[model samples]
Target: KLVIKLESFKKSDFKQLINWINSEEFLIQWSGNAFTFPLDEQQLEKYIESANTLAFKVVDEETSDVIGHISLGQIDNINKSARIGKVLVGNTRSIGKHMMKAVLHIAFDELKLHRVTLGVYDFNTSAISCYEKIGFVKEGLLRESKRVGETYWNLWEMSMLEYEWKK
Candidate 1:
């Protein structure tokens, strides 16, 4: 098994993450326009430095390489819920693997959050399946909720409660 680890995201990791979200489409999909492409240093620095979110970099412990980036944003402590967004992976094959696991571990174990949620665009089947595999249940779907271009796309909302987590 690959020994993947979650590391605190630092300034060193930002460049690799910017290069990973190579296109406008991918950038919007990952960030939901939370970032504008071509994503700039100032824009990224502002977000990461913001108090609203917690960021992480998934690393290949064996090789000491950063394979992906993700964050728990819009954290609501009183509600004990957080939204998972801004998911971007460096390598194509990196998805459907360790990234979700490490993120969830920190959410449930370290952060002690009661519920965690994420929204996925319907067209992104690969990401939806990966979330499902990690035990995120479909909460609901908003019909044609997001306007991607000339057409609209539905948004799938999925979440996992504290008890639902395998721990």
Candidate 2:
């Protein structure tokens, strides 16, 4: 019943994306612990542009509302490999699933890439499960890689190959 449309992220989406960060914990989770408190528009926009990342804003087709953001970056042209990052989906289950699934289609189908990968904090089991449901396979973990307060979070890696995408 739900379909997602991904539009190239525009300057208009900045305010919405900024408002989405409700707390420092969420800031760390979504931005990979890179951004400081109170997100900056010009600064982040410059970073995102210079990095040459393909950023898209996810829209729920049924409601015609922007539901999330997802990007494909860290491209390894030699191996035809790329990383999916900055994923922030709505609590709506279908939105998360559809967004990732659609992004995977773009990766393996549109881009004709060999593989796509993503990393998540091991503590973020909910997101891990969502990735699993989108046909991502767990690769490995970098132990205690992310520090949040007194707690440290491990980086759990997962990926899907083009062969697997055809399935």
Candidate 3:
């Protein structure tokens, strides 16, 4: 429904990304603590510096404006697998669903990955269902996976196999 394209994330786009992340909680929700609070260029540099990571700026094709972020990382050519992370979009399920489709296309069609997985906090029922609608099967739950302040959050590990995507 949304006409958007994934463009290579660049150093010039750092501020917009930092602007999108306002607090530590938001960071955790967006990145799973891959970064620290008050995210800086230094940390972001290290983020894209990894050879195994491919991060992208989700841009609207019509306007050529960045709308969100997503990443495919920990790519293992040996196992033909990778993990998806740092997914962010406008506060709408439609946008989330569309972006998920685009990234999954890259993982399965372009990269020829056998499996692609992601972790979503259990509290994010909306996102979980959105992912489920996109053919991501919940593998299992990781209890108390992360502690945000005094609260420990459970995470749902979800994946889509090559055959699953083809179907």
Candidate 4:
């Protein structure tokens, strides 16, 4: 199995992460509905601060480069859970190499949370497949919920419980 490490986001990582976020491919595939146009530093800082979010740069242990990022947002300590978002393998080459499996392992084993959930655009088949591979089950669908550039998109809600992860 591949290995992953989760660390607090550093200021040094900001530039690279922002660059990835601004990329046409990354923005088009993942941020179309979620984020407004004109990605900026202040917006990123506010998101990091307001959400109390933690960003983990996915590094290739063999090469030690930050090839992707995964983050937890909307944390609810009372509920002992959070929404996982911004899971992107920014490097196209990293796809199909089990990086997401390593991420889910870190989310469950290291974070020790009761549950984790995420929403994906209904049309993102590859992302849905990866989530399923890591044991996330589809819980529901929010129909016609996201409007992006005059198109309405469906959202798929998925979650993996701790008990499920333990097994």
Pairwise lDDT winner, candidates 3 and 4: 3
Candidate 4 wrongly placed segments (more than 4 Å):
1-3, 23-34, 92-107
In candidate 4, residue 31 scores what lDDT? 50
Model 2 misses residue 76 by how many Å?
2.1
The sequence of per-residue lDDT tens digits that candidate 4 reaches over residues 35-113 is 5545667766766676547767777666677777777776677787877777777674444335555555666786667
Higher-scoring candidate on lDDT, 1 or 4: 1
The runs of at least 3 residues in candidate 3 whose Cα sits more than 4 Å from the true structure, single-residue gaps closed, are 90-93
C-alpha-based local distance difference test score of model 3: 0.90
C-alpha lDDT (0 to 100) for residue 118 of candidate 4: 85
How are the candidates ranked when ordered by lDDT, highest leading? 3, 2, 1, 4
lDDT of 1 by residue, 17-100 (tens): 878888888887888858778987888888878876988887777778887888989888888888888877776455545777
Cα lDDT tens digits for candidate 2, 84-149 = 888897547467777888888888898889989898988889889878877889999989988888
Number of residue pairs clashing in candidate 2, backbone atoms closer than 3 angstroms, sequence gap of 3 or more or interchain: 0
Candidate closest to the true structure, highest lDDT: 3
**Model 4 lDDT vs. the true structure?**
0.70
Highest TM-score: which candidate?
A: 3
Q: What is the C-alpha RMSD of each candidate to the true structure, in Å?
A: 1.9, 1.8, 1.4, 2.8
